[PDB]
């Protein structure tokens, strides 16, 4: 808000390299998603140590 009430669509920009040096095409998509979702996940493995002093992963 704070200035006006026009929508801001999402824009999908594309490149070719890892960095931003070589731009490919770039579209903005109408009809916003209603919901995004970004899932994080970290993999842990349990230490099966024979000494049995501690439990850890």
């Amino acid at each position: 808000s704070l200035l006006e009430r026009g929508l801001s669509k999402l824009t999908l920009n594309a490149w070719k390299d890892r960095e931003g040096k070589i731009p490919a095409g770039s579209m903005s998509a109408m009809y916003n998603p209603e919901t995004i979702q970004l899932d994080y996940q970290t993999r842990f493995d349990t230490e099966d140590t024979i000494n049995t002093a501690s439990q850890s992963n």
Partner: protein, 131 residues
């Protein structure tokens, strides 16, 4: 059933693998594989330690299958693994012909038969030739 005799005592433990090997010109062997339990503590947690400590290298090892003698040899090569909470031990046992295999001897054998050379050559361990 299957009863593992070691040094004359019937040695109540748990065999997970037994394999007895016997060929045509080779020393017959027998692999065991045991599991020493760790998760059941108390009186039978060090009483199983007493039964594995009797497995010294070179002992009379006897296997009996359905009240018949299966293997009957001396013990070689006791390997133990201990990965995680598992603690297994692996045995091997070789026949009385194992006493003949790694010591370089020298004899001459003049004026003797094919059999009298060899029945007096197997006799050094207690192996009785039948021919």
């Amino acid at each position: 059933h299957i009863t593992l005799d070691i040094a004359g005592q019937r040695s109540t433990l748990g065999i997970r693998r037994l394999r007895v090997q016997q060929l045509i010109n080779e020393i017959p062997l027998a692999q065991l594989e045991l599991h020493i339990p760790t998760d059941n503590h108390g009186a039978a947690d060090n009483a199983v330690q007493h039964e594995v400590s009797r497995f010294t290298l070179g002992v009379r090892v006897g296997i009996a299958q359905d009240n018949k003698p299966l293997f009957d040899g001396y013990l070689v090569q006791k390997k133990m693994q201990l990965k995680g909470k598992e603690w297994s031990v692996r045995l091997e046992a070789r026949h009385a012909l194992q006493k003949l295999t790694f010591l370089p001897h020298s004899r001459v054998f003049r004026q003797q038969d094919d059999s009298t050379v060899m029945k007096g050559l197997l006799q050094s361990a207690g192996v009785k030739l039948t021919q």
